[PDB]
């Protein structure tokens, strides 16, 4: 239970789900939570509110480490992009930096075919 003052929150915001993983600065995971695991399934899972709850649950999960300052990395276009960050601030972590790490190819691989609905 080594005390980590400075951590990085990784937010994986997809259209279906939100995954929040808090790591040390080296990138070793300390705790995580998901919208799916936070008691939201189906339509509820892909909501900002569900993402918010996941952030809170992740904050509770890493309470022993006594992290004070969080750098935030946001990935993906999902609805949980901003709600999670607000929740982390509400949890009382000081947000030093906010960065978007969504991957973008410089061309890259052919994407899947268009859905016909």
């Amino acid at each position: 239970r080594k005390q980590v003052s400075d951590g990085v929150a990784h937010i994986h915001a997809s259209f279906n789900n939100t995954i929040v993983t808090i790591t040390d600065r080296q990138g070793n995971a300390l705790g995580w939570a998901t919208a799916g695991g936070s008691g939201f399934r189906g339509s509820r899972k892909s909501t900002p509110f569900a993402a918010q709850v996941a952030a809170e649950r992740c904050a509770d999960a890493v309470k022993e480490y006594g992290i004070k300052n969080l750098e935030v990395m946001v990935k993906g276009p999902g609805p949980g992009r901003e709600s999670t960050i607000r929740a982390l601030n509400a949890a009382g972590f000081r947000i030093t930096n906010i960065t978007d790490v969504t991957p973008i190819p410089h061309x890259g691989c052919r994407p899947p075919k268009k859905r016909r609905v």
Binding site: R86, N89, T99, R110, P111
Partner: protein, 55 residues
């Protein structure tokens, strides 16, 4: 879009700056564009249609 919270800056102000930076970078638009493959014929047709509508 890398935002560093300045000293004596409210989180909300910093968050708004992050949102603005993402919009400038057009990260979300790029992601939506790359979700599925657009045939070049489809791409060309869209670009022409946009130009005609603007005119």
């Amino acid at each position: 879009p890398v935002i560093k919270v300045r000293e004596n800056e409210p989180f909300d102000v910093a968050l708004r700056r992050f949102k603005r930076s993402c919009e400038k970078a057009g990260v979300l638009a790029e992601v939506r564009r790359r979700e599925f493959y657009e045939k070049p014929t489809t791409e060309r047709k869209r670009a022409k249609a946009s130009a005609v509508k603007r005119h």
